[PDB]
Write a protein that binds this ligand. Structure first.
Ligand SMILES: Nc1ccccc1C(=O)OP(=O)(O)OC[C@H]1O[C@@H](n2cnc3c(N)ncnc32)[C@H](O)[C@@H]1O
Length: 384
């Protein structure tokens, strides 16, 4: 295969550079603005990090987080985004697990750097003081095997490795094949970027499909969410079942903007589906897993059904194994869901033999019990 770099590949996708990519605190950044900032920042990270060094980013959602993440990748570093409110020992355990060279935290608290106070639109994270001002026209991307580890996603937390190949893989299946996101689409993800679901929705899909995403550094209280819906008016809403439960009293405001409502994280109850169907809003339930990059099995827009997880996305293969390890062919018979496909991770960054056994045989063992109906659609039935 030909060596490549995930940030460079995204930067080369054919979309208008003057269009929005990120929105933050009432401001908007274009693809061009972030691209310029990412290259400048990369020129500084290259003075600090050698290719392969790990970086832990314990930051609230913001354009600077997304861009710093892409700047790490540009120079060949391997970033991980974790909950900024992690306990001290939890942050330490993660940095030790990936042997990180650099941790970047919020203000006031490996080498540790801090964001500025005041929530600026763009942040230098003290790099100007640490390594000096940026180069003007940096482009020294670190290109590598497309199957090699590019960044980590931690889900005892284990670090899931994601590569250039399977990242573009899960983007294609979900953003393109399932949702058919169009350039200019406005996206709003309630889950944050330290969640695999949020990282895809907010960080990657804007670059991948020419869309733009609202980023919010505050926690998603239902009143904060409602504010954002009316200020931003997204076409696509990435939610979870409890969120839609909390949005019932505001159905009018929701349907005024949201045209594609997605739900992931846990099974969407039939009651929630039918309530919003009665109001004329289709909630598409889909399942993803960190070890699979993003959503791999979902209700297709315009064809969703209640109490169902839908059909495997294009390119994915789903299998059900019974308690003796045999593949289940019959419908209405529960088994453990195994999955392979474009988004499948190459494995955990650091793990025991038993931990890596989740990836045994070229499949990811979800640990979810599922059943298939006569048409091939899946239905969540609990955990093993
Ligand atoms: N990482 C993700 C990327 C995209 C979208 C979600 C995720 C995500 O949740 O990743 P995680 O690794 O935290 O958890 C995966 C596990 O969560 C459960 N689950 C998620 N979605 C559903 C659903 N629709 N219906 C039923 N169960 C679901 C299921 O137990 C699964 O094994």
């Amino acid at each position: 295969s030909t060596l490549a770099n995930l940030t460079e590949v995204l930067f080369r996708l054919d979309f208008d550079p003057d269009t929005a990519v990120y929105h933050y605190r009432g401001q908007t950044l274009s693809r061009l603005q972030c691209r310029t900032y990412i290259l400048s920042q990369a020129s500084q990270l290259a003075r600090l990090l050698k290719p392969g060094d790990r970086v832990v980013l314990a930051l609230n959602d913001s354009p600077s987080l997304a861009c710093l993440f892409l700047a790490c990748i540009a120079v060949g570093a391997i970033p991980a985004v974790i909950n900024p409110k992690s306990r001290e020992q939890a942050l330490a355990d993660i940095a030790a697990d990936c042997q990180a060279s650099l941790v970047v935290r919020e203000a006031d608290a490996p080498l540790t750097l801090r964001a500025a106070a005041g929530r600026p639109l763009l942040d230098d994270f003290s790099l100007d003081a640490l390594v000096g001002p940026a180069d003007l026209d940096w482009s020294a991307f670190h290109r590598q095997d497309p199957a090699a580890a590019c960044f980590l996603q931690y889900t005892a937390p284990k670090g899931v490795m994601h590569s250039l190949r399977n990242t573009l893989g899960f983007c294609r299946a979900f953003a393109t094949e399932l949702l058919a996101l169009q350039a200019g689409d406005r996206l709003y993800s309630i889950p944050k970027m330290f969640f695999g679901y949020g990282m895809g929705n907010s960080l990657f899909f804007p670059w991948f499909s020419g869309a733009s995403a609202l980023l919010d550094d505050t926690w998603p209280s239902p009143e904060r969410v409602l504010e954002n819906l009316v200020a931003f008016r997204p076409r696509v809403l990435f939610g979870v079942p409890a969120i839609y439960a909390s949005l019932r009293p505001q159905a009018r405001e929701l349907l005024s903007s949201v045209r594609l409502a997605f739900s992931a994280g846990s099974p969407l109850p039939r009651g929630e589906f039918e309530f919003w169907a009665a109001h004329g809003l289709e909630i598409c339930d889909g399942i993803g897993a960190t070890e699979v990059g993003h959503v791999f099995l979902a209700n297709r827009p315009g064809q969703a059904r209640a109490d169902s997880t839908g059909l495997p996305l294009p390119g994915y293969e789903c299998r059900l194994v019974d308690r003796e390890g045999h593949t289940i062919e019959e419908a209405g018979r529960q088994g453990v869901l195994l999955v392979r496909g474009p988004g499948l991770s190459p494995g955990y960054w650091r793990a025991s033999e038993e931990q890596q056994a989740r990836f045994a045989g070229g499949w990811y063992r979800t640990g979810d019990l599922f059943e298939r109906d006569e048409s091939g659609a899946y239905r969540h039935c609990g955990r093993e």
